[PDB]
RNA sequence: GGGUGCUCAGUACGAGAGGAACCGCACCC
RNA sequence: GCCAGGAUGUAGGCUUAGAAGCAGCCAUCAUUUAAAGAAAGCGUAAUAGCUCACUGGU
């Protein structure tokens, strides 16, 4: 499960390439993150000369997880990676392009811009 | 196997030959086997530069050669010596086999003045014997 | 009302202002001629009995302003 | 004593007093220590002693009776007014329907012996024979949405001083 | 009583920047 | 205590943007009164409103 020190791929064009989880937001006791949860993380890798830099602390919403989610209709959806979107504070992506497929669960957490920019939603 | 060393050198007149020269760890020094012309064998501390084959003699007529032992009165001023006798016929009690050979500095009457390696100076009775050479 | 005793007295007296009254009287004017006249005109507004009373009041306002 | 006007019938039974009249009928119980009697044409109240608490009880009992007599003789009323754009009252049957800024209207039905009249959409009148019950229902109506401090919107008594 | 998501509403209000509140829904303790 | 009067010239004069009983400066008369200040406070931008003094009642 995604927890402190878990590495997450960044599914946006903000400049960040990978982040390392510091904590899961939502109240004392929260330890694991799944789709829709917001984490505080440190940028582990980033493209040089960009707006986001290595070592910086950012907030990011989880949009794809290997653990997945069970749905009310009996379906279960999971992905082949744990990914997140940074975010400006209003949830909009800092970059202008999203690479690779993203999970539809992001729609429930109001990450509408990312869903619209995604090449495909599964 | 600690060997018996001759510190008396009283086989006067009888020629001996340095048979061998070996180390003696119990003496931290070298010793030589001496075969005498009369059949007797004896070990002595081997002075510096003594080699297998050289002859050895002791007594008043001995040749002044390293390894030879004579009464101090029969020894040339300036010669280095060791295994110095303090009492005629009591064997050497000074510089027996460790240290630095003393040196004859002068002869006066019945005395022979000798300067030990320590700068120390002593007037021993010429009757006392000493071996020529460096230990 | 009619012109206050003050303005009547001002116009009568012949001035545009009052005073520091006890000390610097601002002007003189004739009573039995003028104070009476004013007393007459001001009468509808005076609770006076006789004109002589009507006067005492008018003359009394003239003092407050020094005339 | 309290004068019993014409048309008014007063009945006393222990500490319970019933007064009937053209405008209504009211029954009220009073403090045990007070003695109430209909002396022919007037109601008299007799306290047991002259201490203070009794003297105070005596005047309080007397007033209540006076007002009970006023209520059934001189049918009582209390007016309220609505202040606020869109705030209005209407009469739908015996029910008072209030539109006072909530998602839906508030409907109030008076109990027996009470009437509510709405002469204009921003005026409500509560009336009945019992002065107390009239006072109580009007306080309950106002309490649905009392006047707010910034603009004075809500329900207020007719002469309510509520400076914004 | 409380936790949480939401709604009320980008409404009311405010010159603007901004921006509620009272009403109400759902899972949970 | 409670009820009712507390008035007329008149917003006195002057001054002041205003200045009306009540910023300040002069005064502080007179009327009709049972009584009622050219007003003792609050109030007003100035007004208004409210009290008070005095009088009646109870």
| DSSP per-residue string spanning A24-86 | E-SSTT---B-TT-EEEEEEEEE-TTSSS-TT-EEEEEEEE-SS-EE-TTS-EE--SS-EEE-
Q: How are beta strands D16-21 and D9-13 bridged, if at all?
A: antiparallel
Contact B58, B110 (CB under 8 A): no
Inter-helix orientation angle C5-13/C51-65, to 10°? 70
What is the spatial distance between Cα B113 and Cα A105, in angstroms, rounded to a whole number? 116
Distances (CA, A) of B94 to B58, B74, B135, C32: 18, 18, 11, 171
Look at chain C and count its residues: 67
Between CA C59 and C1' F7 the distance (Å) reads 24
* B76 plus B129 within the same structural domain: yes
* B26 plus B86 within the same structural domain: no
What is the spatial distance between Cα B17 and Cα B110, in angstroms, rounded to a whole number? 32
Q: Nucleotide F28: nearest residue by CA–C1'?
A: C64
Contact D98, D105 (CB under 8 A): yes
Distances (CA, A) of A20 to A14, A109, B26, B112, C25: 16, 21, 75, 98, 99
| Structural domain count of chain B | 2
Three-state secondary structure call for residue D73: helix
Residue B84 buriedness (CB in 10 A; 0-12 / 13-18 / 19+): buried
Contact A85, A115 (CB under 8 A): no
* Other beta carbons less than 10 A from residue D24's beta carbon: 21
* Other beta carbons less than 10 A from residue C33's beta carbon: 9
Owning domain of residue B41? 1-56
Side-chain half-sphere CA neighbours of D80 within 13 A = 31
Q: For residue B44, what is the domain's CATH number?
A: 2.40.50.140
Phi-psi region of B89 (alpha: psi -120 to 50; beta: other; left: phi over 0): left
Q: Is D151 near strand E, with its CB below 7 A from some atom of it?
A: no
Name the resolution in angstroms: 5.0
Contact A82, A58 (CB under 8 A): no
Contact A2, A84 (CB under 8 A): no
Distances (CA, A) of D147 to D82, D89, D125, D137, D156: 9, 16, 18, 17, 6
* B29 plus B85 within the same structural domain: no
* B127 plus B75 within the same structural domain: yes
Instruction: Return the H-helix or E-strand segment holding A21.
Output: strand A16-24
Side-chain half-sphere CA neighbours of D91 within 13 A = 13
Q: Which residues pair with D44 in a beta bridge?
A: D37
Residue D10 buriedness (CB in 10 A; 0-12 / 13-18 / 19+): buried
Closest alpha carbon to D137 in D101, D161, D111: D111
Between CA C39 and C1' F22 the distance (Å) reads 28
Contact A12, A93 (CB under 8 A): yes
Instruction: Return the H-helix or E-strand segment holding C9.
Output: helix C5-13
List of long-range contacts for B90-96, beta carbons under 8 Å, 24+ apart: B91/B7, B91/B8, B91/B9, B92/B7, B92/B8, B92/B9, B92/B129, B92/B130, B92/B131, B95/B135, B96/B7, B96/B45, B96/B135
- What's the DSSP call for residue B48? T
The overall longest dimension of chain B from CA atoms, in Å, is 44
Tokens encoding B36: 């005498």
Between CA C46 and C1' F5 the distance (Å) reads 22
Q: Which residues pair with D77 in a beta bridge?
A: D127
Distances (CA, A) of D61 to A56, B21, C62, D21: 80, 150, 66, 20
What is the per-residue burial (b if ≥16 Cβ within 10 Å, else e) of D27-46? Answer: ebebeeebebebeeeebebe
What is the spatial distance between Cα A2 and Cα A8, in angstroms, rounded to a whole number? 8
Contact A61, A106 (CB under 8 A): yes
List of long-range contacts for A86-92, beta carbons under 8 Å, 24+ apart: A86/A10, A86/A12, A86/A14, A86/A16, A86/A19, A86/A52, A86/A58, A86/A59, A86/A60, A87/A14, A87/A58, A87/A59, A87/A60, A87/A61, A89/A59, A91/A61
Which method resolved this structure? Answer: X-ray
Closest alpha carbon to B72 in B15, B132, B8: B132
Distances (CA, A) of D110 to D125, D127, D130, D131: 12, 10, 13, 14
What is the spatial distance between Cα B107 and Cα B110, in angstroms, rounded to a whole number? 8
Three-state secondary structure call for residue D88: strand
Please give the span between the terminal C-alpha atoms of chain C, in angstroms, as a whole number.
23
* B92 plus B74 within the same structural domain: yes
Chain B touching partners, 3 or more CB pairs below 8 A = none
Question: Domain D76-164 in CATH: superfamily?
Answer: Ribosomal protein L6 (3.90.930.12)
What is the spatial distance between Cα B101 and Cα B78, in angstroms, rounded to a whole number? 12
Please give the nucleotide, over all strands, whose C1' is closest to the CA of residue C57.
F29
Side-chain half-sphere CA neighbours of B122 within 13 A = 15
- SS3 letters across B69-124: EEEHHHCCCCCEEECEECCCCCCEEECCCCCCCEEEEEEECCEEEEECCCCCEEEE
* B16 plus B65 within the same structural domain: no
Closest alpha carbon to D115 in D91, D88, D145: D91
Owning domain of residue C15? 1-67
* B17 plus B29 within the same structural domain: yes
Please give the nucleotide, over all strands, whose C1' is closest to the CA of residue C62.
F13
Q: For residue C4, what is the domain's CATH number?
A: 1.10.10.250
Between CA C38 and C1' E29 the distance (Å) reads 95
Q: Is A110 near strand E, with its CB below 7 A from some atom of it?
A: yes
What is the spatial distance between Cα A63 and Cα A72, in angstroms, rounded to a whole number? 19
What is the spatial distance between Cα C64 and Cα C58, in angstroms, rounded to a whole number? 10
Q: Which residues pair with B41 in a beta bridge?
A: B35
Owning domain of residue A114? 1-122
| Structural domain count of chain C | 1
CB within 8 Å of A90: residues ≥ 6 apart: none
* B130 plus B70 within the same structural domain: yes
Sign of the CA dihedral with D3 first, then D5, D10, and D16 last:
negative
Q: Boundaries of CATH 3.90.930.12 in chain D? A: 1-75, 76-164
Q: For residue A94, what is the domain's CATH number?
A: 2.40.150.20
* B122 plus B66 within the same structural domain: yes
Q: What is the dihedral of CA A49, A51, A53, A56, to 10 degrees?
A: 160
Distances (CA, A) of D94 to D90, D112, D114, D118: 11, 11, 10, 11
Contact B14, B52 (CB under 8 A): no
Contact A33, A2 (CB under 8 A): yes
Chain E positions with any atom < 7 A from a protein CB: 3-4, 6, 8, 22-24
Distances (CA, A) of D54 to A91, D39, D47, D51: 74, 21, 6, 6
Q: Is D102 near strand E, with its CB below 7 A from some atom of it?
A: yes
Contact A27, A40 (CB under 8 A): no
Task: Provide the CATH number for the domain formed by D1-75 in this structure.
Answer: 3.90.930.12
- Cα angle vertex D94, ends D88, D100, to 5°? 20
CB within 8 Å of B122: residues ≥ 6 apart: B113, B114, B115, B116
| Structural domain count of chain A | 1
Tokens encoding D103: 């998602």
* B47 plus B66 within the same structural domain: no
* B107 plus B94 within the same structural domain: yes
Closest alpha carbon to D82 in D70, D96, D62: D96
């Amino acid at each position: 499960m995604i927890q402190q020190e878990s590495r997450l791929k960044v599914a946006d064009n903000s400049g960040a390439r990978e982040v390392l989880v510091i904590k899961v937001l939502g109240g004392s006791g929260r330890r694991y993150a799944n789709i829709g949860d917001v984490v505080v993380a440190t940028v582990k890798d980033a493209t040089p000369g960009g707006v986001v830099k290595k070592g910086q602390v950012v907030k990011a919403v989880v949009v794809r997880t290997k653990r997945g989610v069970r749905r009310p209709d009996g379906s279960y959806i999971r992905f082949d990676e744990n990914a997140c979107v940074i975010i400006r504070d209003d949830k909009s992506p800092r970059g202008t392009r999203i690479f690779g497929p993203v999970a539809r669960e992001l729609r429930d957490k109001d990450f509408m811009k990312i869903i619209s920019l995604a090449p495909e939603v599964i | 196997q600690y060997r018996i060393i001759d510190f008396k050198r009283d086989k006067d007149g009888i020629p001996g030959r340095v048979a061998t020269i070996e180390y003696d760890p119990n003496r931290s020094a070298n010793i030589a086997l001496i075969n005498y012309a009369d059949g007797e064998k004896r070990y002595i501390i081997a002075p510096k530069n003594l080699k297998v084959g050289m002859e050895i003699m002791s007594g008043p007529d001995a040749d002044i050669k390293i390894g030879n032992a004579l009464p101090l009165e029969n020894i040339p001023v300036g010669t280095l010596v060791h295994n110095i006798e303090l009492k005629p016929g009591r064997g050497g009690q000074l510089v027996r086999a460790a240290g630095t050979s003393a040196q004859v500095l002068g002869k006066e009457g019945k005395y022979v003045i000798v300067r030990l390696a320590s700068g120390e100076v002593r007037m021993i009775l010429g009757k006392c014997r000493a071996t020529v050479g460096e230990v | 009302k009619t012109p206050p005793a003050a303005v009547l007295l001002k116009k009568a007296a012949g001035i545009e202002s009052g005073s520091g009254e006890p000390n610097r009287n601002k002007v003189a004017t004739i009573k039995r001629d003028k104070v009476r006249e004013i007393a007459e005109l001001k009468m509808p507004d005076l609770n006076a009995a006789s004109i002589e009373a009507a006067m005492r009041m008018i003359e009394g306002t003239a003092r407050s302003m020094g005339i | 004593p309290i004068e019993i006007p014409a048309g008014v019938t007063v009945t006393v039974n222990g500490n319970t007093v019933t007064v009937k009249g053209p405008k209504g009928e009211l029954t009220r119980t009073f403090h045990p220590d007070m003695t109430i009697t209909v002396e022919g044409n007037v109601i008299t109240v007799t306290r047991p002693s002259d201490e203070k608490h009794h003297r105070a009880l005596h005047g309080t009992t007397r007033s209540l009776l006076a007002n009970m007599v006023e209520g059934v003789s001189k049918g009582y009323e209390k007016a309220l007014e609505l202040v606020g754009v869109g705030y209005r009252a209407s009469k739908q049957g015996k029910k008072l329907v209030l539109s006072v800024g909530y998602s839906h209207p508030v409907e109030i039905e008076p109990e027996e012996g009470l009437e509510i009249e709405v002469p204009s959409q921003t005026k409500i009148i509560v009336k009945g024979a019992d002065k107390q019950r009239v006072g109580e229902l009007a306080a309950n109506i106002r309490a649905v949405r009392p006047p707010e401090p910034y603009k004075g919107k809500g329900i207020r008594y007719e002469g309510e001083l509520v400076r914004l």
